[PDB]
Symmetry: D2
Subunit: 194 residues, 4 copies
């Protein structure tokens, strides 16, 4: 469902839910009731983020409650990604390169799923650059090499040496960092955020 | 703060998919500075359509990039005095069926829609069904006697409910109410949640 | 059907972690036939403790292995006539503070607990706070005038609420009610949800 | 929180939630109020599944609402599994071996997470044995070899050939099956249910 069509349906649902007619809602938004009826006819495409915020406010809810879900990009419940159509971004932490991300398949039907194959380019644990923690949990598996993992308080972190084949779970918001085991050059991880 | 929340959630999501300003800007046909501006709270004029494209490219929903409803409570409470409650007519098939008197609501629990409903007609035969609504509903007969109908409107389940009676109607179940035959009118407290 | 639902959910979970009867039975110190029996609905006599070990070994909760509350509705509706509603005394510090008259409830929405509360004392000075409860609460003043207090009981927020007034109290917010000073008593409809 | 201690706390919470005293609840369960008080003092360990079902029933809720969550087996938000402490079960479908599962790390803090390294032993797509679909979504990545995937209606399935490095998402409940590409012998997958 497109933005304006989904909005049109949800706006009407919410308005009816709080027992308001077009007139009542219009009176709260500096518009005519005809303009409100138009939005419910799919003509709200040009409403600004600020205006949507006001619409959600007077209707006592959130913009999210008035907009459609991400959508369906599946083929009868499945979506596949071939190896060479894999995205690749440079993870630089502290003005120096840390990670080379190879993006795996993603889907609007499960937006939190962000799987990646990460090449860890540094092998100096003291170079470990902590992130702030992720929304969502994360499963990891050491694909190649040896990983020196750190987590928790960046000033007094927990640490573990993970050989190839090892797997780990890191809870949402837990800060963590990764590097190849001291002097081992480089390692590879498959990281699955979910 | 719609723009402030968007600014924050946009940066978070962009970071979740390991994209930098240039990466995201490209997919959107924008410059990296424009994207930086959005994350600096300058996204207020983006249209619903543009928000849709931004969410699409980020593989998520507009909702995931916008903040929650907000907090309109006073230390966890919001009260509403009588006579300051909204009042709208409920017309079905050109007939003043119900009179909706809106009670307190809060952005901290958007699905809560409590109302005092004046049930105007007292002829069950002329009951008008709604097609059921999303969300559960709790009802209490405040005054008079209610004649309720639910389910298949062609062969509905029914109940005569005196004052003090209470009912629960599950989401999506069609229902209708009128006062008991010849009792003139009745009143319900209906709490959608 | 507690055992039937368990039978089904146990098999599902066991299958999710790719275990066969023998694998699971080993970890539990049982024979594979005993485990097959559970999945054949013969788990009724398992104790809370044993259920805890089974969930542990399956890396999940007892809840994930037991069915939902159940459906006690008649085509989506459940009604309750007055005078068949539960009634329990609310004693705080050895004082009959409230009189709880229970309205309709349903296993299809367990958190819904609607009540008509008789507020017995009319001296705000002697208000007794609860420490806040889980879940939101909607209230409506049915009769009389209510003197409500909330928040920090040592320096609370307060409101005088006439009949028809409505209120929303967020989960975990401490609160107390008495009738307005010298009005004898009052009545509230309180809907926990 | 242990079973009986968690139950003790939740039972009391629920009983108070529906404004019942020990006596009222006992009257509905063939027990004395003293017995009910004992349960709330952590002595409900011997209650049977059937008895718990009745307790949940009269309290108008589920057994789940009266028992603690799975628990916390994390080390400051993380749990690691070394390669050689990896479980291994034989996935046999139709009286013949299909898969050899190598279980990766799991956690009670996210019970739906079941990651595995699966060795696909057959390379005859016609041997493909469909499952019934999983509760929960599933991310997959072809670790080695080539996979012949099938999904949807087992009688008229969608199919795709996936080379090494390919990734896929299969929505919960969507039936699917896997084999090595015709005559390629065998392949390997990392499957992450979540
Ligand atoms: C491997 C990955 O978790 C590094 P980060 O994306 O969490 O910073
Ligand atoms: C009483 C109330 O439930 C009627 P409707 O608002 O759902 O149409
Ligand atoms: C009126 C009601 O909220 C009092 P309590 O049941 O929460 O203690
Ligand atoms: C690889 C894995 O998905 C096969 P199944 O466990 O779903 O049957
Ligand atoms: Co991470
Ligand atoms: Co209704
Ligand atoms: Co309360
Ligand atoms: Co699968």
């Amino acid at each position: 469902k497109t933005a304006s069509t989904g909005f049109a349906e949800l706006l009407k649902d919410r308005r009816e839910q709080v027992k308001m007619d077009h007139a009542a809602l219009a009176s709260l938004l500096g518009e005519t009731p005809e303009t409100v009826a138009a939005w419910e006819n799919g003509e709200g495409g040009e409403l600004t983020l600020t205006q949507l915020g006001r619409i959600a406010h007077v209707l006592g809810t959130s913009i999210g409650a008035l907009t459609p879900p991400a959508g369906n990009d599946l083929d009868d419940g499945v979506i596949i990604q071939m190896p060479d159509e894999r995205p690749i971004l440079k993870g630089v932490r502290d003005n120096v390169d840390y990670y080379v991300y190879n993006c795996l398949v993603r889907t609007k039907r499960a937006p939190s799923l962000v799987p990646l194959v990460v090449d860890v380019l540094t092998d100096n644990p003291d170079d470990a650059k902590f992130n702030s923690g992720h929304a969502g949990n994360e499963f990891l598996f050491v694909l190649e090499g040896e990983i020196h993992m750190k987590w928790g308080d960046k000033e007094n972190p927990k640490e573990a040496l993970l050989p190839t084949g090892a797997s780990m779970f890191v809870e949402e918001h837990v800060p963590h960092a990764f590097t190849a085991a001291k002097g081992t050059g480089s390692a590879k991880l498959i990281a699955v955020n979910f």
